[PDB]
Design a protein around this nucleic acid. Structure first.
Ligand code: ZN
Ligand code: ZN
Ligand code: ZN
Ligand code: ZN
Ligand code: ZN
Ligand code: ZN
Lengths: 123, 121
RNA sequence: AUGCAUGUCUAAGACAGCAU
């Protein structure tokens, strides 16, 4: 579909934050869609990119790439999260939706809160 | 904390499935925590792995790596997730990326991209 | 040798690439 504004609600450690991501176009060369946070200093905008690659000479499976980049103003630091999905030509949408919704749920588990928010491995 | 059973509910396209992932030990060599579904064959079970890397002399950043592997009775579906944070990152910043990602994965854009393999234009 | 917020696959592994 057409690249539109994404509004992400009840996020943050608290679940009290909203993030409005405005469309910044689809690059015709590589198909990468770009969004970035409304309302901020260009170089400090929280950013998202998404791409979907078909099988080709270069590639046996479908590959979906999701990337987040969040700047903090200074020493300027960046936080990154990068997601790659891999799905064959014979996967079903039930299978792909399972992985998508699995990961979303995983990201709210005590196991992943400790690893990410607290940087604590399980033992 | 001690590697423990993870129960993920209200998942699948329908929002009506639940996955129960059981502890399969932390690797003494590399710190990698394994979990997996119950089942009769180790190769037809849905898997998750988690790892946290500390900064060393060699690398200046923290890194959290999650892998999902879901086989079907035979093709494999994968998700690979890397988080990369500086030593001066705060927990507010890391939790923001975490929960931002989870929400992103429920948006029309990612439903289109992942479920329907349909990019935006 | 190390590193990667690069990619590819039979995926905690292999391989291609970049950087140092
Ligand atoms: Zn279907
Ligand atoms: Zn992968
Ligand atoms: Zn990497
Ligand atoms: Zn890679
Ligand atoms: Zn690997
Ligand atoms: Zn190489």
């Amino acid at each position: 579909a057409k690249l539109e504004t994404v509004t992400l609600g009840n996020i943050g450690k608290d679940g009290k934050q909203t993030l409005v991501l405005n469309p910044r176009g689809v690059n015709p060369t590589n198909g990468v869609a770009s969004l970035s946070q409304a309302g901020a200093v260009r170089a400090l905008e929280k950013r998202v990119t998404v791409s979907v690659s078909q099988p080709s000479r270069n590639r046996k499976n479908y590959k979906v790439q999701v990337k987040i980049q969040n700047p903090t103003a200074g020493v300027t630091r960046q936080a990154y999260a990068d997601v790659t999905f891999s799905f064959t030509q014979y996967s079903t949408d039930e299978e792909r939706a399972f992985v998508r919704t699995e990961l979303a749920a995983l990201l709210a588990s005590p196991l992943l809160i400790d690893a990410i928010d607290q940087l604590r491995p399980a033992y």
